[PDB]
Amino acid sequence: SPVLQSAYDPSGQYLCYVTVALDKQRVGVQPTQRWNENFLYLEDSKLKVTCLKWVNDTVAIILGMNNGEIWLYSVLANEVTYKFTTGNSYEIKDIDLMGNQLWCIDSSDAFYQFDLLQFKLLQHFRINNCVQLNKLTIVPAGDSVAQLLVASHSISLIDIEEKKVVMTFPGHVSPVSTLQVITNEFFISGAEGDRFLNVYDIHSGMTKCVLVAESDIKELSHSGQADSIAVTTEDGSLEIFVDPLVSGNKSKKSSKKIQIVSKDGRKVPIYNAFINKDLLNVSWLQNATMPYFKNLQWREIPNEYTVEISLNWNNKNKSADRDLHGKDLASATNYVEGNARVTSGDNFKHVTGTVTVILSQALQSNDHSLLETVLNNRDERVIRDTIFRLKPALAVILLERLAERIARQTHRQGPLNVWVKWCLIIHGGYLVSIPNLMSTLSSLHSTLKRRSDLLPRLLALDARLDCTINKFKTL
Amino acid sequence: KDANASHPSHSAIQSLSFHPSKPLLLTGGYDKTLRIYHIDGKTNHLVTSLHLVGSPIQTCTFYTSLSNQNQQNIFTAGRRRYMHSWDLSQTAKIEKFSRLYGHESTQRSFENFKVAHLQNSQTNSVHGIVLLQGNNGWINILHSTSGLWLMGCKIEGVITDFCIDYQPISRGKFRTILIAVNAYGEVWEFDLNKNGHVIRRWKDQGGVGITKIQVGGGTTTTCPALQISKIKQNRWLAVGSESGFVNLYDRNNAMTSSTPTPVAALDQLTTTISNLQFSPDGQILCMASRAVKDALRLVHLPSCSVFSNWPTSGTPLGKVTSVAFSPSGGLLAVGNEQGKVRLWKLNHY
Amino acid sequence: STARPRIITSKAPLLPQQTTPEQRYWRQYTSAQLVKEHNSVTHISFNPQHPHDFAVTSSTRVQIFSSRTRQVIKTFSRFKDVVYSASFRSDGKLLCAGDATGLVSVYDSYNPRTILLSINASTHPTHVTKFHTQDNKILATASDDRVTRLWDISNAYEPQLELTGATDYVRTLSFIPAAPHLVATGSYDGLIRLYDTRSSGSTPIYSLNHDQPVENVIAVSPTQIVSCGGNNFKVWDLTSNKKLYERGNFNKAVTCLDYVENFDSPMQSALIASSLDGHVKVFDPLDNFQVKFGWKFSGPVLSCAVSPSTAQGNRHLVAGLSSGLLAIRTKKKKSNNFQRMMRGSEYQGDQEHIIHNDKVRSQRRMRAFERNINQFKWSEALDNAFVPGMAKELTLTVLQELRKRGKVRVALYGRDESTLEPLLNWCLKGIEDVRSASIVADWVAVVLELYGNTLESSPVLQELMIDLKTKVRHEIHKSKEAQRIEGMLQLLT
RNA sequence: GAAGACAAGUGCUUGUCGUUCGUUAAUGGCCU
Lengths: 475, 349, 493
What we know:
Chain C: One of its GO terms (molecular function) is U3 snoRNA binding. Chain A is α+β, with helices and mostly antiparallel strands. Helix content of chain A is 20%, strand content 33%.
């Protein structure tokens, strides 16, 4: 994970998260409800942030870290206000602030107490029987600071006033990662790389119950009334147990599960969830460092849930200027005729040695390779005698075939004009009887009307031809 | 950990760049991809990965304006007639610089570009410029955002490289000097602050086939400053050959002698020089060749001595095609023909 | 900005009988080679499984051809009398051969040497021997003995079902792809029998009352069959037992008939038929079996066949004529360091986040006249149009567009006496058509009104204008005749 | 159709408007 440590404020409005930036750590605060560009860089490439906490008089976060000092950094102005200096030079494993009494752990087990109002160190103070200590929380017994908990691979409650350990607890085989008090009598404890959480009693010493996850445990947050514990696992998911203190009996599994899976099918890791009164704030990394958030009511959500978000996995880059393909949208789309059918306004559509028998055979069948052989003759008396002994039903077919040849071949308007003339004369009586003449002779009527409207244009060319012809015939 | 280990490329990495303020490595190659990674210490990740269609990427550098400090354009080009400019949700604003406003006869290819800044000197309106190689001698200078052809200088012979040197004259005012080279070594120094002219021409002692010039030690086109106050004159000038030699010139006597003697002629690379890059402090010059495996040589400056313990016979380099420094962290991102940008850290910085 | 529109090619209103898309597909069947044969070829049957072969029958010799080489692969010359039919099975392995001596022989494809089976039918000649389509183990043969027989090839000595009840000379039978129990049987007196082999099989379920003799029956559909008989051909709905269409568009009796469905064509399926007039006419059942295209050969055609739907290569039309001719009409169809150099040229963005394609799509190349019009060299554009090898459609396009956008006077201001001669040589050949003469009228009248002074001295253009005068006498008189026949249609309406 | 204003004659005559009223032809062509 690119984010090393992230801590929520109380009541859930911002988080301060630390990250690597060209091997120089930087801390930034992001709102979680609703971009940002304000960070604090660490000026040395060795010193690294180890532990983090908020302060509830501008809002300030606490940076106890590797170099030995504890930084107090105001969120609103990117400036550290004060640095609390540990007398030795050791990293600070954990911090806590309740009241004005900040408490921290040295790497060499030395407790320290710091005052906010006086900016002073109260008591450098060591103990026995705890050779390693890495996590501390204090109890909210009142306004007092007494009986802080401290733990590393075993848990010990230690009273400040008598400077002694009160009661130990059987800890975990790994070092403890999460150690938070929840109510006044139970505190959660979780190791590193362990899928187990225990609510140990602060007075009985016996564990009330144990909370198991599905995977190893990284981050934890809890509601103030101990009804919900929201634990973020390491692999990236979120489990929420409802009423952990209610009465398997000894081990309680995950009540509800929340994962975040992107729309393309890829999985998205989860870090640092937050819970409140009916409010959950799951956090994840949209880009490599930029954190994205989502508020969601978690009681109506079923026992398994996948929040789906929109990563630009294979997104085509639409542009405001560009259309779907190259051009602009203020570019006027030019007219293209393309494959458009072009018609006319007259084209109706469903609105003595003769050759008669070889023409009637060539019209009953659609044998155009033989109709032309019949039509090669130009002896006009034969043309009269063929239409005389022609079937009147086949004459309508003859007019359609003659019309297609005079339309296609404009040079064939010579001989075929006497063929259509002789046919309309002989079978004129039958042609009145058939009513849909615009349907039948549509090819004939369209060819004739198109060849007849040319005439004023051809006459205009001819007399203008004859002006220049008579100009040079005279001289 | 290598920066390409989060998501591998598919072609040879052809150019790298680091963001002048942000942690951001931009990788581009013949994959037609601009893969912007984040640079952690342990876990690098993709910030974004823009794939142009049909447009190979040979050079890709970031650019931040001096005055605005908020534009953060990404310029990429290739063996085409266009240069894709990427600005800095869901979509991406990518305009193409496919318009030579005066003449397309010279630069029919955009693949050799370097982005610098320039001052108007009538007003103090600093703005970016892009400089492009051309047909024979033509280095053409265009406006970075408006796209207008600003000016154009022609050298004799064949261009092989060009670099840009700055010179702060007075308070908040600096003159940009373009240093361009012939194949022979006829290094020209144009003054882009005023109109197209020459400050000086001279001769590199040697360098029969020259590949690269990098002017470093201060503000350069690869690792610039962020404001007019921090713009500093470069202190050294490196002239790289094709026979492996690199001739260094200190600017304190190269601007005066007018036929300057090289300080030292480094010889430890054999094949043709593909990259000369100076550290932003100016103390490590990285010469890289691309015709053989393990062709990286770092030289201590000003001792002009190659480091003995770096690199060894067990370092992963491959055919080194593009090297990148870091402006703050002292990091060194080195490409290869396998498309695995491998990342090192100089621990003194 | 705006992309420049292309100069659109001009178009008149369309003439009747234009080229249909179904005509444009079928006229690709070109390169009609002709192979001489020793007798009247009667049957052509393709290969159903891998259609790269078709079998053509002849006098005592069925020879297998190729779809690739269109040549004789093999010959089958083991026959006493003339072989009548030769149908492949649906597996494509085993082909029949009905012989006129009485007994049929079926053997493996691509192997004349191994006569696999020789079933002895009745002593009458067997005209058609067809294999089952859905089934792959039962042979159905007819004879002049007026009985059809269904032989399982396991028992090639006794007929499994002696299908009787025929009237006279069953010469073509077919199966139906839906029901395997139903066998269509066509006699030679009409009476298209439909037989059932699941029953006793000695009497048809029903018959189709074709009057004239039927020569071919083909299942055009699971519920429709088509009957090739006499001067016309009729289709029948099987379940309704009723004829549906009847197309009398043949001069003589249709003899052979073939059908193909779902082959790559602008229509879904095509039904072809040989007409015994040299004509093979295609029909489609979606267009009510109307005629779409007809090839014409020299002699009458006795056998017609097309390649099946799944040829995946050059498709063939094989038509066999009476004069021993096989007409085949066919529709045809660096260094390894340099690959490691530039590896991302075949990537195309399969896993990257944002894809941005901005390459403008290349157009058709711009012609010579379109370049000059865009560069506004109008005087050079008009001379660029009249290159003699260029089509007459686009010469009208330049004349129209230069008239519309510019003027005809601007293209004629710089003309010389010799430069007008390419212009006047085209209007001699363009005045006859109605399509151009409305544009020829303007483009000649500009010459007559402006260059009427240089006609007085130059005799070369004087001959051109005289020849234009003698051609406009024919054009006007043709249009005067056209108005007379226009005056006819008001008399008879 | 009228007025207000400038050129060619050795002081007025010779035309036209970035003026009002009344009235039915500068070698100059269209990206990537």
